[PDB]
């Protein structure tokens, strides 16, 4: 569907100022960003892979695709949003006692096939995403 380029560069900066719910409170509910987290954790559960009885394998790569018109209002940077959301989702997987392989990376990207006021987040266990 969308072959990625081989990038092992797992963007690393120590954002001690991590923002997750900040987006909702900034827009003041004009748009509901938290609806993403909601469906994201839902998609995480839908992507749970039956592994050893101790703990289930949760998705690591989440492709969050919104409409162009939504994304532009969110802001053109995937990076800062990715940092906040990945850290938040990674916290969730710990909380649920799930495990994964690689690094939890959430991708925010837009597609013209995706309409305004719509978003889709698909998380899967993807080891073919080198996160070094």
mmCIF file of N, CA and C in Angstrom:
data_model
loop_
_atom_site.group_PDB
_atom_site.id
_atom_site.type_symbol
_atom_site.label_atom_id
_atom_site.label_comp_id
_atom_site.label_asym_id
_atom_site.label_seq_id
_atom_site.Cartn_x
_atom_site.Cartn_y
_atom_site.Cartn_z
ATOM 1 N N UNK A 1 0.828 -1.214 0.000
ATOM 2 C CA UNK A 1 0.000 0.000 0.000
ATOM 3 C C UNK A 1 0.858 1.258 0.000
ATOM 4 N N UNK A 2 1.852 1.302 0.855
ATOM 5 C CA UNK A 2 2.705 2.453 0.934
ATOM 6 C C UNK A 2 4.065 2.074 1.436
ATOM 7 N N UNK A 3 4.912 1.653 0.526
ATOM 8 C CA UNK A 3 6.256 1.258 0.841
ATOM 9 C C UNK A 3 7.024 2.449 1.394
ATOM 10 N N UNK A 4 7.617 2.263 2.530
ATOM 11 C CA UNK A 4 8.371 3.300 3.163
ATOM 12 C C UNK A 4 9.804 3.201 2.730
ATOM 13 N N UNK A 5 10.559 4.234 2.973
ATOM 14 C CA UNK A 5 11.964 4.201 2.663
ATOM 15 C C UNK A 5 12.691 3.684 3.874
ATOM 16 N N UNK A 6 13.791 3.013 3.662
ATOM 17 C CA UNK A 6 14.528 2.399 4.741
ATOM 18 C C UNK A 6 15.252 3.453 5.575
ATOM 19 N N UNK A 7 14.647 3.787 6.684
ATOM 20 C CA UNK A 7 15.174 4.758 7.597
ATOM 21 C C UNK A 7 15.295 4.101 8.950
ATOM 22 N N UNK A 8 16.506 3.911 9.418
ATOM 23 C CA UNK A 8 16.717 3.292 10.720
ATOM 24 C C UNK A 8 16.793 4.380 11.787
ATOM 25 N N UNK A 9 16.805 5.623 11.316
ATOM 26 C CA UNK A 9 16.893 6.795 12.161
ATOM 27 C C UNK A 9 15.638 6.960 12.998
ATOM 28 N N UNK A 10 15.668 6.443 14.185
ATOM 29 C CA UNK A 10 14.583 6.636 15.088
ATOM 30 C C UNK A 10 14.869 7.954 15.777
ATOM 31 N N UNK A 11 14.163 8.998 15.342
ATOM 32 C CA UNK A 11 14.332 10.380 15.838
ATOM 33 C C UNK A 11 14.424 10.417 17.358
ATOM 34 N N UNK A 12 15.532 10.908 17.857
ATOM 35 C CA UNK A 12 15.758 10.924 19.264
ATOM 36 C C UNK A 12 16.206 12.267 19.805
ATOM 37 N N UNK A 13 15.390 12.805 20.648
ATOM 38 C CA UNK A 13 15.663 13.998 21.388
ATOM 39 C C UNK A 13 14.957 13.799 22.682
ATOM 40 N N UNK A 14 15.515 14.247 23.759
ATOM 41 C CA UNK A 14 14.885 14.023 25.030
ATOM 42 C C UNK A 14 13.887 15.107 25.358
ATOM 43 N N UNK A 15 12.710 14.971 24.789
ATOM 44 C CA UNK A 15 11.628 15.886 25.055
ATOM 45 C C UNK A 15 11.060 15.609 26.414
ATOM 46 N N UNK A 16 11.526 16.343 27.392
ATOM 47 C CA UNK A 16 11.001 16.233 28.729
ATOM 48 C C UNK A 16 9.664 16.943 28.793
ATOM 49 N N UNK A 17 9.464 17.825 27.851
ATOM 50 C CA UNK A 17 8.222 18.475 27.664
ATOM 51 C C UNK A 17 7.496 17.718 26.584
ATOM 52 N N UNK A 18 6.806 16.731 27.002
ATOM 53 C CA UNK A 18 6.053 15.898 26.136
ATOM 54 C C UNK A 18 4.601 16.353 26.191
ATOM 55 N N UNK A 19 3.991 16.566 25.052
ATOM 56 C CA UNK A 19 2.633 17.039 25.028
ATOM 57 C C UNK A 19 1.702 16.055 24.329
ATOM 58 N N UNK A 20 0.671 15.667 25.030
ATOM 59 C CA UNK A 20 -0.298 14.757 24.491
ATOM 60 C C UNK A 20 -1.673 15.375 24.452
ATOM 61 N N UNK A 21 -2.206 15.703 25.619
ATOM 62 C CA UNK A 21 -3.570 16.248 25.713
ATOM 63 C C UNK A 21 -3.568 17.740 25.464
ATOM 64 N N UNK A 22 -2.372 18.287 25.299
ATOM 65 C CA UNK A 22 -2.176 19.698 25.035
ATOM 66 C C UNK A 22 -2.910 20.138 23.791
ATOM 67 N N UNK A 23 -2.941 19.282 22.810
ATOM 68 C CA UNK A 23 -3.579 19.582 21.547
ATOM 69 C C UNK A 23 -5.082 19.847 21.723
ATOM 70 N N UNK A 24 -5.735 19.023 22.526
ATOM 71 C CA UNK A 24 -7.163 19.171 22.782
ATOM 72 C C UNK A 24 -7.458 20.482 23.491
ATOM 73 N N UNK A 25 -6.674 20.770 24.514
ATOM 74 C CA UNK A 25 -6.859 21.963 25.315
ATOM 75 C C UNK A 25 -6.462 23.246 24.566
ATOM 76 N N UNK A 26 -5.520 23.144 23.626
ATOM 77 C CA UNK A 26 -5.137 24.298 22.800
ATOM 78 C C UNK A 26 -6.281 24.690 21.874
ATOM 79 N N UNK A 27 -6.825 23.716 21.156
ATOM 80 C CA UNK A 27 -7.918 23.987 20.230
ATOM 81 C C UNK A 27 -9.240 24.188 20.960
ATOM 82 N N UNK A 28 -9.247 23.855 22.240
ATOM 83 C CA UNK A 28 -10.401 24.059 23.092
ATOM 84 C C UNK A 28 -11.589 23.231 22.677
ATOM 85 N N UNK A 29 -11.321 22.092 22.085
ATOM 86 C CA UNK A 29 -12.386 21.221 21.663
ATOM 87 C C UNK A 29 -12.988 21.605 20.319
ATOM 88 N N UNK A 30 -12.353 22.545 19.589
ATOM 89 C CA UNK A 30 -12.822 22.918 18.240
ATOM 90 C C UNK A 30 -12.776 21.670 17.356
ATOM 91 N N UNK A 31 -11.755 20.911 17.578
ATOM 92 C CA UNK A 31 -11.563 19.633 16.995
ATOM 93 C C UNK A 31 -11.218 18.753 18.155
ATOM 94 N N UNK A 32 -11.461 17.491 18.050
ATOM 95 C CA UNK A 32 -11.171 16.604 19.146
ATOM 96 C C UNK A 32 -9.982 15.731 18.792
ATOM 97 N N UNK A 33 -8.761 16.142 19.191
ATOM 98 C CA UNK A 33 -7.558 15.370 18.925
ATOM 99 C C UNK A 33 -7.563 14.083 19.716
ATOM 100 N N UNK A 34 -8.094 14.146 20.956
ATOM 101 C CA UNK A 34 -8.144 12.986 21.880
ATOM 102 C C UNK A 34 -8.965 11.823 21.352
ATOM 103 N N UNK A 35 -9.708 12.070 20.294
ATOM 104 C CA UNK A 35 -10.473 11.043 19.655
ATOM 105 C C UNK A 35 -9.500 10.097 18.931
ATOM 106 N N UNK A 36 -8.321 10.631 18.605
ATOM 107 C CA UNK A 36 -7.267 9.861 18.010
ATOM 108 C C UNK A 36 -6.735 8.888 19.035
ATOM 109 N N UNK A 37 -6.316 9.389 20.215
ATOM 110 C CA UNK A 37 -5.824 8.533 21.314
ATOM 111 C C UNK A 37 -6.827 7.443 21.636
ATOM 112 N N UNK A 38 -8.082 7.838 21.691
ATOM 113 C CA UNK A 38 -9.186 6.921 21.954
ATOM 114 C C UNK A 38 -9.202 5.761 20.949
ATOM 115 N N UNK A 39 -9.219 6.081 19.665
ATOM 116 C CA UNK A 39 -9.269 5.043 18.634
ATOM 117 C C UNK A 39 -7.906 4.346 18.493
ATOM 118 N N UNK A 40 -6.854 5.048 18.861
ATOM 119 C CA UNK A 40 -5.485 4.550 18.792
ATOM 120 C C UNK A 40 -5.301 3.400 19.770
ATOM 121 N N UNK A 41 -5.752 3.593 21.007
ATOM 122 C CA UNK A 41 -5.648 2.544 22.018
ATOM 123 C C UNK A 41 -6.625 1.408 21.703
ATOM 124 N N UNK A 42 -7.710 1.759 21.032
ATOM 125 C CA UNK A 42 -8.686 0.795 20.565
ATOM 126 C C UNK A 42 -8.042 -0.081 19.470
ATOM 127 N N UNK A 43 -7.292 0.563 18.585
ATOM 128 C CA UNK A 43 -6.623 -0.099 17.475
ATOM 129 C C UNK A 43 -5.484 -0.958 18.010
ATOM 130 N N UNK A 44 -4.872 -0.500 19.098
ATOM 131 C CA UNK A 44 -3.821 -1.241 19.770
ATOM 132 C C UNK A 44 -4.360 -2.582 20.244
ATOM 133 N N UNK A 45 -5.554 -2.551 20.828
ATOM 134 C CA UNK A 45 -6.228 -3.754 21.309
ATOM 135 C C UNK A 45 -6.586 -4.674 20.135
ATOM 136 N N UNK A 46 -6.928 -4.061 19.024
ATOM 137 C CA UNK A 46 -7.294 -4.768 17.787
ATOM 138 C C UNK A 46 -6.046 -5.340 17.095
ATOM 139 N N UNK A 47 -4.892 -4.849 17.483
ATOM 140 C CA UNK A 47 -3.654 -5.295 16.901
ATOM 141 C C UNK A 47 -2.864 -6.192 17.827
ATOM 142 N N UNK A 48 -3.469 -6.567 18.939
ATOM 143 C CA UNK A 48 -2.837 -7.432 19.914
ATOM 144 C C UNK A 48 -2.606 -8.817 19.337
ATOM 145 N N UNK A 49 -1.389 -9.273 19.436
ATOM 146 C CA UNK A 49 -1.002 -10.523 18.896
ATOM 147 C C UNK A 49 -0.839 -11.495 20.030
ATOM 148 N N UNK A 50 -1.545 -12.592 19.938
ATOM 149 C CA UNK A 50 -1.498 -13.640 20.916
ATOM 150 C C UNK A 50 -0.084 -14.203 21.008
ATOM 151 N N UNK A 51 0.563 -13.918 22.094
ATOM 152 C CA UNK A 51 1.920 -14.324 22.317
ATOM 153 C C UNK A 51 1.910 -15.141 23.597
ATOM 154 N N UNK A 52 3.079 -15.374 24.189
ATOM 155 C CA UNK A 52 3.215 -16.104 25.452
ATOM 156 C C UNK A 52 2.197 -15.604 26.482
ATOM 157 N N UNK A 53 1.723 -16.512 27.316
ATOM 158 C CA UNK A 53 0.640 -16.240 28.255
ATOM 159 C C UNK A 53 0.954 -15.185 29.285
ATOM 160 N N UNK A 54 2.200 -14.819 29.377
ATOM 161 C CA UNK A 54 2.601 -13.791 30.290
ATOM 162 C C UNK A 54 2.160 -12.435 29.789
ATOM 163 N N UNK A 55 2.419 -12.163 28.526
ATOM 164 C CA UNK A 55 2.113 -10.872 27.948
ATOM 165 C C UNK A 55 2.003 -10.925 26.427
ATOM 166 N N UNK A 56 1.077 -10.158 25.929
ATOM 167 C CA UNK A 56 0.668 -10.134 24.534
ATOM 168 C C UNK A 56 1.471 -9.109 23.781
ATOM 169 N N UNK A 57 1.656 -9.341 22.501
ATOM 170 C CA UNK A 57 2.479 -8.485 21.707
ATOM 171 C C UNK A 57 1.596 -7.390 21.123
ATOM 172 N N UNK A 58 1.893 -6.179 21.477
ATOM 173 C CA UNK A 58 1.152 -5.030 21.044
ATOM 174 C C UNK A 58 1.824 -4.416 19.822
ATOM 175 N N UNK A 59 1.057 -3.715 18.970
ATOM 176 C CA UNK A 59 1.603 -3.035 17.797
ATOM 177 C C UNK A 59 2.643 -1.982 18.178
ATOM 178 N N UNK A 60 3.582 -1.767 17.300
ATOM 179 C CA UNK A 60 4.632 -0.798 17.539
ATOM 180 C C UNK A 60 4.545 0.353 16.553
ATOM 181 N N UNK A 61 4.168 0.056 15.328
ATOM 182 C CA UNK A 61 4.030 1.086 14.335
ATOM 183 C C UNK A 61 2.572 1.387 14.109
ATOM 184 N N UNK A 62 2.223 2.631 14.301
ATOM 185 C CA UNK A 62 0.875 3.098 14.130
ATOM 186 C C UNK A 62 0.837 4.133 13.049
ATOM 187 N N UNK A 63 0.111 3.854 12.018
ATOM 188 C CA UNK A 63 -0.027 4.765 10.928
ATOM 189 C C UNK A 63 -1.318 5.522 11.130
ATOM 190 N N UNK A 64 -1.198 6.769 11.450
ATOM 191 C CA UNK A 64 -2.319 7.621 11.674
ATOM 192 C C UNK A 64 -2.456 8.543 10.484
ATOM 193 N N UNK A 65 -3.437 8.287 9.700
ATOM 194 C CA UNK A 65 -3.682 9.040 8.531
ATOM 195 C C UNK A 65 -4.953 9.859 8.681
ATOM 196 N N UNK A 66 -4.825 11.142 8.505
ATOM 197 C CA UNK A 66 -5.971 12.028 8.510
ATOM 198 C C UNK A 66 -6.128 12.668 7.162
ATOM 199 N N UNK A 67 -7.192 13.427 7.022
ATOM 200 C CA UNK A 67 -7.408 14.172 5.833
ATOM 201 C C UNK A 67 -6.438 15.311 5.786
ATOM 202 N N UNK A 68 -6.125 15.764 4.599
ATOM 203 C CA UNK A 68 -5.168 16.848 4.415
ATOM 204 C C UNK A 68 -5.623 18.095 5.178
ATOM 205 N N UNK A 69 -6.921 18.369 5.096
ATOM 206 C CA UNK A 69 -7.520 19.543 5.712
ATOM 207 C C UNK A 69 -7.452 19.441 7.252
ATOM 208 N N UNK A 70 -7.481 18.233 7.777
ATOM 209 C CA UNK A 70 -7.363 18.039 9.223
ATOM 210 C C UNK A 70 -5.932 18.218 9.640
ATOM 211 N N UNK A 71 -5.034 17.595 8.887
ATOM 212 C CA UNK A 71 -3.626 17.575 9.203
ATOM 213 C C UNK A 71 -3.021 18.979 9.194
ATOM 214 N N UNK A 72 -3.387 19.777 8.210
ATOM 215 C CA UNK A 72 -2.871 21.128 8.082
ATOM 216 C C UNK A 72 -3.271 21.998 9.276
ATOM 217 N N UNK A 73 -4.454 21.753 9.804
ATOM 218 C CA UNK A 73 -4.923 22.469 10.990
ATOM 219 C C UNK A 73 -4.241 21.961 12.241
ATOM 220 N N UNK A 74 -3.821 20.707 12.212
ATOM 221 C CA UNK A 74 -3.091 20.136 13.335
ATOM 222 C C UNK A 74 -1.707 20.735 13.362
ATOM 223 N N UNK A 75 -1.157 20.879 12.198
ATOM 224 C CA UNK A 75 0.152 21.397 12.047
ATOM 225 C C UNK A 75 0.964 20.481 11.174
ATOM 226 N N UNK A 76 1.864 21.050 10.404
ATOM 227 C CA UNK A 76 2.618 20.306 9.400
ATOM 228 C C UNK A 76 3.651 19.332 9.978
ATOM 229 N N UNK A 77 4.046 19.507 11.231
ATOM 230 C CA UNK A 77 5.054 18.609 11.806
ATOM 231 C C UNK A 77 4.396 17.325 12.321
ATOM 232 N N UNK A 78 4.836 16.171 11.858
ATOM 233 C CA UNK A 78 4.472 14.915 12.478
ATOM 234 C C UNK A 78 5.284 14.683 13.768
ATOM 235 N N UNK A 79 6.547 15.120 13.739
ATOM 236 C CA UNK A 79 7.570 14.842 14.774
ATOM 237 C C UNK A 79 7.167 15.133 16.231
ATOM 238 N N UNK A 80 6.697 16.336 16.529
ATOM 239 C CA UNK A 80 6.402 16.709 17.915
ATOM 240 C C UNK A 80 5.166 16.000 18.396
ATOM 241 N N UNK A 81 4.267 15.775 17.476
ATOM 242 C CA UNK A 81 3.030 15.086 17.761
ATOM 243 C C UNK A 81 3.324 13.605 17.964
ATOM 244 N N UNK A 82 4.230 13.093 17.152
ATOM 245 C CA UNK A 82 4.663 11.725 17.217
ATOM 246 C C UNK A 82 5.316 11.454 18.563
ATOM 247 N N UNK A 83 6.163 12.377 19.002
ATOM 248 C CA UNK A 83 6.864 12.247 20.258
ATOM 249 C C UNK A 83 5.855 12.125 21.432
ATOM 250 N N UNK A 84 4.847 12.987 21.422
ATOM 251 C CA UNK A 84 3.858 12.995 22.475
ATOM 252 C C UNK A 84 2.990 11.759 22.474
ATOM 253 N N UNK A 85 2.470 11.420 21.315
ATOM 254 C CA UNK A 85 1.572 10.284 21.163
ATOM 255 C C UNK A 85 2.269 8.935 21.354
ATOM 256 N N UNK A 86 3.490 8.789 20.842
ATOM 257 C CA UNK A 86 4.220 7.526 20.973
ATOM 258 C C UNK A 86 4.529 7.237 22.426
ATOM 259 N N UNK A 87 4.949 8.266 23.147
ATOM 260 C CA UNK A 87 5.272 8.139 24.558
ATOM 261 C C UNK A 87 4.022 7.800 25.367
ATOM 262 N N UNK A 88 2.905 8.383 24.984
ATOM 263 C CA UNK A 88 1.644 8.152 25.682
ATOM 264 C C UNK A 88 1.151 6.728 25.439
ATOM 265 N N UNK A 89 1.219 6.291 24.188
ATOM 266 C CA UNK A 89 0.784 4.952 23.796
ATOM 267 C C UNK A 89 1.717 3.895 24.421
ATOM 268 N N UNK A 90 3.009 4.201 24.477
ATOM 269 C CA UNK A 90 3.985 3.300 25.082
ATOM 270 C C UNK A 90 3.711 3.140 26.577
ATOM 271 N N UNK A 91 3.174 4.182 27.176
ATOM 272 C CA UNK A 91 2.824 4.158 28.587
ATOM 273 C C UNK A 91 1.662 3.196 28.770
ATOM 274 N N UNK A 92 0.688 3.292 27.855
ATOM 275 C CA UNK A 92 -0.475 2.408 27.841
ATOM 276 C C UNK A 92 -0.102 0.961 27.748
ATOM 277 N N UNK A 93 0.792 0.619 26.825
ATOM 278 C CA UNK A 93 1.153 -0.785 26.652
ATOM 279 C C UNK A 93 1.799 -1.348 27.920
ATOM 280 N N UNK A 94 2.575 -0.509 28.612
ATOM 281 C CA UNK A 94 3.167 -0.886 29.891
ATOM 282 C C UNK A 94 2.061 -1.134 30.906
ATOM 283 N N UNK A 95 1.100 -0.219 30.943
ATOM 284 C CA UNK A 95 -0.036 -0.278 31.848
ATOM 285 C C UNK A 95 -0.896 -1.529 31.652
ATOM 286 N N UNK A 96 -0.956 -2.004 30.441
ATOM 287 C CA UNK A 96 -1.761 -3.169 30.124
ATOM 288 C C UNK A 96 -0.957 -4.451 30.253
ATOM 289 N N UNK A 97 0.339 -4.304 30.398
ATOM 290 C CA UNK A 97 1.195 -5.444 30.498
ATOM 291 C C UNK A 97 1.410 -6.091 29.151
ATOM 292 N N UNK A 98 1.528 -5.281 28.127
ATOM 293 C CA UNK A 98 1.804 -5.774 26.799
ATOM 294 C C UNK A 98 3.259 -5.504 26.443
ATOM 295 N N UNK A 99 3.774 -6.244 25.491
ATOM 296 C CA UNK A 99 5.161 -6.105 25.058
ATOM 297 C C UNK A 99 5.207 -5.906 23.564
ATOM 298 N N UNK A 100 6.337 -5.519 23.040
ATOM 299 C CA UNK A 100 6.475 -5.325 21.629
ATOM 300 C C UNK A 100 7.959 -5.411 21.259
ATOM 301 N N UNK A 101 8.275 -5.270 19.989
ATOM 302 C CA UNK A 101 9.645 -5.331 19.515
ATOM 303 C C UNK A 101 9.924 -4.150 18.624
ATOM 304 N N UNK A 102 10.985 -3.457 18.910
ATOM 305 C CA UNK A 102 11.315 -2.280 18.172
ATOM 306 C C UNK A 102 11.065 -1.095 19.042
ATOM 307 N N UNK A 103 10.723 0.007 18.459
ATOM 308 C CA UNK A 103 10.345 1.169 19.227
ATOM 309 C C UNK A 103 8.977 1.605 18.766
ATOM 310 N N UNK A 104 8.157 2.029 19.695
ATOM 311 C CA UNK A 104 6.794 2.443 19.398
ATOM 312 C C UNK A 104 6.803 3.782 18.681
ATOM 313 N N UNK A 105 6.409 3.768 17.439
ATOM 314 C CA UNK A 105 6.409 4.948 16.625
ATOM 315 C C UNK A 105 5.043 5.182 15.992
ATOM 316 N N UNK A 106 4.518 6.354 16.210
ATOM 317 C CA UNK A 106 3.271 6.725 15.641
ATOM 318 C C UNK A 106 3.532 7.693 14.489
ATOM 319 N N UNK A 107 2.956 7.413 13.381
ATOM 320 C CA UNK A 107 3.146 8.190 12.191
ATOM 321 C C UNK A 107 1.934 9.012 11.922
ATOM 322 N N UNK A 108 2.118 10.276 11.751
ATOM 323 C CA UNK A 108 1.041 11.152 11.381
ATOM 324 C C UNK A 108 1.267 11.587 9.970
ATOM 325 N N UNK A 109 0.383 11.200 9.108
ATOM 326 C CA UNK A 109 0.483 11.536 7.727
ATOM 327 C C UNK A 109 -0.896 11.747 7.137
ATOM 328 N N UNK A 110 -0.949 12.359 5.998
ATOM 329 C CA UNK A 110 -2.204 12.684 5.379
ATOM 330 C C UNK A 110 -2.330 12.030 4.030
ATOM 331 N N UNK A 111 -3.536 11.811 3.630
ATOM 332 C CA UNK A 111 -3.826 11.273 2.353
ATOM 333 C C UNK A 111 -5.001 12.020 1.771
ATOM 334 N N UNK A 112 -4.980 12.234 0.489
ATOM 335 C CA UNK A 112 -6.049 12.917 -0.207
ATOM 336 C C UNK A 112 -7.301 12.027 -0.311
ATOM 337 N N UNK A 113 -7.093 10.725 -0.157
ATOM 338 C CA UNK A 113 -8.160 9.741 -0.165
ATOM 339 C C UNK A 113 -8.913 9.742 1.155
ATOM 340 N N UNK A 114 -8.361 10.422 2.121
ATOM 341 C CA UNK A 114 -8.950 10.510 3.420
ATOM 342 C C UNK A 114 -9.632 11.884 3.477
ATOM 343 N N UNK A 115 -10.858 11.927 3.958
ATOM 344 C CA UNK A 115 -11.641 13.148 3.917
ATOM 345 C C UNK A 115 -11.517 13.970 5.182
ATOM 346 N N UNK A 116 -12.041 15.174 5.123
ATOM 347 C CA UNK A 116 -11.973 16.119 6.205
ATOM 348 C C UNK A 116 -12.898 15.715 7.350
ATOM 349 N N UNK A 117 -12.336 15.659 8.529
ATOM 350 C CA UNK A 117 -13.060 15.290 9.696
ATOM 351 C C UNK A 117 -13.055 13.809 9.860
ATOM 352 N N UNK A 118 -12.021 13.190 9.374
ATOM 353 C CA UNK A 118 -11.876 11.801 9.458
ATOM 354 C C UNK A 118 -10.421 11.496 9.751
ATOM 355 N N UNK A 119 -10.180 10.401 10.409
ATOM 356 C CA UNK A 119 -8.853 9.976 10.730
ATOM 357 C C UNK A 119 -8.876 8.470 10.849
ATOM 358 N N UNK A 120 -7.794 7.842 10.565
ATOM 359 C CA UNK A 120 -7.665 6.424 10.750
ATOM 360 C C UNK A 120 -6.300 6.106 11.239
ATOM 361 N N UNK A 121 -6.245 5.340 12.273
ATOM 362 C CA UNK A 121 -5.011 4.933 12.853
ATOM 363 C C UNK A 121 -4.973 3.447 12.810
ATOM 364 N N UNK A 122 -3.983 2.901 12.176
ATOM 365 C CA UNK A 122 -3.808 1.518 12.065
ATOM 366 C C UNK A 122 -2.473 1.140 12.647
ATOM 367 N N UNK A 123 -2.527 0.340 13.661
ATOM 368 C CA UNK A 123 -1.351 -0.113 14.311
ATOM 369 C C UNK A 123 -1.158 -1.568 14.073
ATOM 370 N N UNK A 124 0.048 -1.949 13.820
ATOM 371 C CA UNK A 124 0.366 -3.318 13.580
ATOM 372 C C UNK A 124 1.743 -3.599 14.163
ATOM 373 N N UNK A 125 2.062 -4.849 14.328
ATOM 374 C CA UNK A 125 3.364 -5.224 14.774
ATOM 375 C C UNK A 125 4.245 -5.299 13.549
ATOM 376 N N UNK A 126 5.056 -4.313 13.378
ATOM 377 C CA UNK A 126 5.909 -4.236 12.240
ATOM 378 C C UNK A 126 7.354 -4.234 12.674
ATOM 379 N N UNK A 127 8.053 -5.341 12.470
ATOM 380 C CA UNK A 127 9.465 -5.431 12.791
ATOM 381 C C UNK A 127 10.324 -4.877 11.647
ATOM 382 N N UNK A 128 9.686 -4.640 10.512
ATOM 383 C CA UNK A 128 10.371 -4.179 9.309
ATOM 384 C C UNK A 128 10.552 -2.674 9.330
ATOM 385 N N UNK A 129 10.415 -2.107 10.495
ATOM 386 C CA UNK A 129 10.664 -0.715 10.709
ATOM 387 C C UNK A 129 11.795 -0.604 11.714
ATOM 388 N N UNK A 130 12.953 -0.368 11.196
ATOM 389 C CA UNK A 130 14.128 -0.343 11.989
ATOM 390 C C UNK A 130 14.210 0.915 12.785
ATOM 391 N N UNK A 131 14.220 0.736 14.049
ATOM 392 C CA UNK A 131 14.212 1.798 14.965
ATOM 393 C C UNK A 131 15.481 1.772 15.812
ATOM 394 N N UNK A 132 16.504 2.401 15.284
ATOM 395 C CA UNK A 132 17.807 2.421 15.878
ATOM 396 C C UNK A 132 18.091 3.810 16.439
#
